[PDB]
Write a protein that binds this ligand. Structure first.
Ligand SMILES: COc1ccc(CC[C@@H](OC(=O)[C@@H]2CCCCN2C(=O)[C@H](c2cc(OC)c(OC)c(OC)c2)[C@@H]2C=CCCC2)c2cccc(OCCN3CCOCC3)c2)cc1OC
Length: 128
C-alpha cells in the first residue's frame, strides 16, 4: 500500500542519503518557492504508524496545522520534508525512527523504534 510504494519509489531527501525520509509527490504544487527556515507553515495532514493501528489527522480538529519550519517544533522528518514542498503540493513521507521518535518513542501514541507514514498538503507559508 502507500507506505510500501514510498519505500520502492520514494526519493531519499535526507542529507546523509540514509533512506531515513522518503518522499513521493502525490499532487504537484504551484509556483516555484519552497519554505525557508523560520517560516510559519500551514498544512493539512494524516499520519499513522507503519506497524500497528494509530492514525492522526489535522482534519478532525477542525483547522490547518501550523508550525515554524526547521526549528524543532515537529519531528525531523517533517522539518526536512516540508522544506521540499511547493504551495498546494501533497506528498507522502515515510519516516524511519531516527527522523521521528527514535529508540525512546512517545507513548501512548508512539512506540520505541516506530516508522511513521504521513500525507501532507502544504497550504501556505509566510516569513515570520
Ligand atoms: C523536536 O522533536 C519533536 C518536536 C515536537 C514533538 C511533539 C509531537 C509533534 O508531532 C509531530 O512532530 C508529528 C508531525 C506533525 C503532526 C503530528 N506528528 C506526529 O507524530 C503525530 C502526533 C500527534 C499528536 O497530537 C496531535 C501528538 O501529541 C502531542 C503526538 O505526540 C507524540 C504525535 C503522530 C503521527 C502518527 C500517528 C500518531 C500520532 C507535535 C504534535 C502536536 C503539535 C505540535 O506542534 C504544535 C505547534 N507548536 C506548539 C508549541 O509552540 C510551537 C508550535 C507538534 C516531538 C518531538 O520529538 C519528541
Amino acid at each position: 500500500g502507500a507506505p510500501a510504494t514510498v519505500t520502492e519509489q520514494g526519493e531519499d531527501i535526507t542529507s546523509k542519503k540514509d533512506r531515513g525520509v522518503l518522499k513521493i509527490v502525490k499532487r504537484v504544487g504551484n509556483g516555484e518557492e519552497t519554505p525557508m527556515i523560520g517560516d510559519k507553515v500551514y498544512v493539512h495532514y494524516k499520519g499513522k504508524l507503519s506497524n500497528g493501528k494509530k492514525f492522526d489527522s489535522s482534519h478532525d480538529r477542525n483547522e490547518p496545522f501550523v508550525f515554524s519550519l526547521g526549528k524543532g517544533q515537529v519531528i525531523k522528518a517533517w522539518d526536512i520534508g516540508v522544506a521540499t514542498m511547493k504551495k498546494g503540493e501533497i506528498c507522502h513521507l515515510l519516516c524511519k525512527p531516527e527522523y521521528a521518535y527514535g529508540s525512546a518513542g512517545s507513548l501512548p501514541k508512539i512506540p520505541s523504534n516506530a516508522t511513521l507514514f504521513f500525507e501532507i498538503e502544504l497550504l501556505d507559508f509566510k516569513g515570520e
